[PDB]
Amino acid sequence: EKTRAKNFLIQYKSYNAKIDRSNNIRSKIERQIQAIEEGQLISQTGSIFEGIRD
């Protein structure tokens, strides 16, 4: 039933793109958490240097 066979193959690789869609969205958000971790400490560093100045 090679028609149906390649159709299962069509539906088979139909998921793989969707898994990759997830993985890249995960990686993108992990990177954007880190920018709030690193960014948040930089912000406070700026305020004590303001305390030194005044």
């Binding site: 090679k2 066979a5 390649k6 193959l9 069509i10 539906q11 088979y12 690789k13 139909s14």
Partner: protein, 55 residues
């Protein structure tokens, strides 16, 4: 009593209510086939040859 049966088995009304049913029947059944219209999308968006290697 034959008069009272013939008032309400009137062939003027038998033929009306029989024609009305048939129109609604073809209305509903064709409204089931457009309810299965999506095969035209499935057969279109996926045409993937590459799996002949996978075969």
């Amino acid at each position: 009593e034959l008069k009272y049966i013939a008032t309400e088995a009137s062939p003027a009304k038998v033929a009306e209510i029989a024609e009305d049913s048939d129109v609604y029947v073809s209305e509903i059944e064709e409204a089931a086939d457009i309810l299965a219209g999506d095969p035209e999308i499935d057969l279109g968006i996926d045409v993937t040859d590459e799996l002949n290697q996978l075969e």
